[PDB]
Amino acid sequence: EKQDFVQHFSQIVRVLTEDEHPEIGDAIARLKEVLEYNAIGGKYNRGLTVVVAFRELVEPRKQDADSLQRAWTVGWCVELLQAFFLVADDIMDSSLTRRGQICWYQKPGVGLDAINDANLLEACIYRLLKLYCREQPYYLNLIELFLQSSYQTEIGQTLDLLTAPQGNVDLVRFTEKRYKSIVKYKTAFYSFYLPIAAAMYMAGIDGEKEHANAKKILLEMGEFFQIQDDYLDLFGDPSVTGKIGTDIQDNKCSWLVVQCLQRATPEQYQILKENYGQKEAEKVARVKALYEELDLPAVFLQYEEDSYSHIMALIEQYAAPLPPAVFLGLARKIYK
Amino acid sequence: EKQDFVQHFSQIVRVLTEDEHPEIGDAIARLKEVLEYNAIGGKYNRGLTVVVAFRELVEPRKQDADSLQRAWTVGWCVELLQAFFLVADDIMDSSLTRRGQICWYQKPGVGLDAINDANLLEACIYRLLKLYCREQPYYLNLIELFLQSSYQTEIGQTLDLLTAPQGNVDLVRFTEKRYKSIVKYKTAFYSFYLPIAAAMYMAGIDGEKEHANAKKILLEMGEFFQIQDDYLDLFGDPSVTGKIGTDIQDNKCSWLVVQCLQRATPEQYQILKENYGQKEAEKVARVKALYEELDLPAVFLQYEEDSYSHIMALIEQYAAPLPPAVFLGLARKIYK
């Protein structure tokens, strides 16, 4: 399934680049480069979720060649949206690598031009929806879903960045309540709600209450996914994660620091105060050592188990009348 | 009219900030700040063009309070789009001031976070269209117009930036053909076509051929407007323009350098080669002095006259069945 999804990318790049209007040539070329470098090399889970859910929600007699093409394309739209956000997120977080290669903006000859490049990736979403879904009943529902999920992700990023001012001790700000708001908005809407909801609209499941019920499950899964992202920022294997962690030196409201603040002794609070939020390797190591001294890996592992049980309880409550398998396949993939 | 348009901004900021969901509070606050700093202080010509054209194209018996509100809001959408692009353009062009104050990203405590802030301004366009135009016949036409004009502006910005690589002599690239493509895409679609076309759709003028005819006039006006922007980058009064010029030190394909290359002697070409595209004030002054020695102000002034006559000839050819006054009021404003 992931090999089939990735094979459809050649076709996407081909239709996005067919406007070559020789004049715009050299920017179409650059657009190819941005797409090749930036939407390829991930696991493709968010885009595949659209396709998997589409096949589970749509009656097989309605799954002809062209409706399947529209599903693959919408899944690539979700991946282009993630590519838009990541590019810009790597600039703002001062990140070094992404998916096992240097962040696009560190590429010599790119730099802050990456800002345009990211806006273009966003623009491609709507070009693809027009090329493929324009005459479908769900066209406007999808455009609106993508725009709303962007807005919600940018609100989240705003909070992320206001809670993490550079060069400024922000520990008082780092609370559970605040953390939960950050991750709801910055990650949960676009990573989980968006692709399932997109498949739902394509299948003609438009009801407010069915979308609300699906959202109840999916926003909690997204919360877990971001907690996991925070854990792996520091404790993940960078040959697996494909990215260097910057949360400590970026002064982020990570699940780790939140959990640390609620366990630290007043001596340990001062260690964090003196070392969090700074570029010095030795300072970052003191924080990591405090996390390790507080058995934060053990705490994450227990949370992963408790979170799983909680999400499965919500699937029991809220999945119907959708197939639980939609949610269960997602759970398998993120608690893997 | 500009005082009425500006008065409606309080209401726009109020509806954009009514989601205060206490959790997202502090990002709504920041969103207010971004809107107050970044969509205010211009001349508002692009947003007013929507309103002026709306009143001229819509039968007065159809211009009730609420349809007029929708026109003011769509005009603010066009201004939010310009605010999105300028913010990001000031980062990528390394600009110092905008509208008589420091560029938002130079504000201490903003910096590259301005990237998110700009994406949020874009997002506000679609929130306003949904809040105000959702049940109108032209809703989808407007969303599609705004998205398309963004795409086209980002393609233009891509070309602008590829033709102007930092630290790299690009004079061979700087041709009339290339310049015309740049400005068509980066400026002409969103500054002129966009607001008139928006008013056209609101008035129920949806025809392909009427939009094409309007576009014929408006893209040429936009070409002139960018040529004027290039001229004033170096020769404008910064107490009038409100911005410091960076085209020479940014290595831009400005109308000025294009015109200089077609008049320069081989000695003068080498002066440009040795001094264009560099941060040193003394080098920038050599280029300005070469422009002045080539009587480029005199050339711009003659071009302004010839361009005016050309645009008026196109209004004669292509305005009907729209009122010429729509185009003539625009011409007055840009050749002012």
Ligand SMILES: O=P(O)(O)C(O)(Cc1cccnc1)P(=O)(O)O
């Ligand atoms: O991939 P990253 O940078 O670890 C992350 O998950 C990326 C991201 C970007 C935009 C929204 N949500 C998450 P972050 O929040 O920066 O820790």
Ligand SMILES: O=P(O)(O)C(O)(Cc1cccnc1)P(=O)(O)O
């Ligand atoms: O306001 P500026 O920076 O003079 C400009 O007109 C701004 C701009 C931004 C985006 C698209 N078109 C023009 P530019 O092209 O940068 O010279």
Ligand SMILES: [Mg+2]
């Ligand atoms: Mg990041």
Ligand SMILES: [Mg+2]
């Ligand atoms: Mg981030």
Ligand SMILES: [Mg+2]
């Ligand atoms: Mg992370």
Ligand SMILES: [Mg+2]
């Ligand atoms: Mg600029």
Ligand SMILES: [Mg+2]
């Ligand atoms: Mg520019």
Ligand SMILES: [Mg+2]
């Ligand atoms: Mg300029």
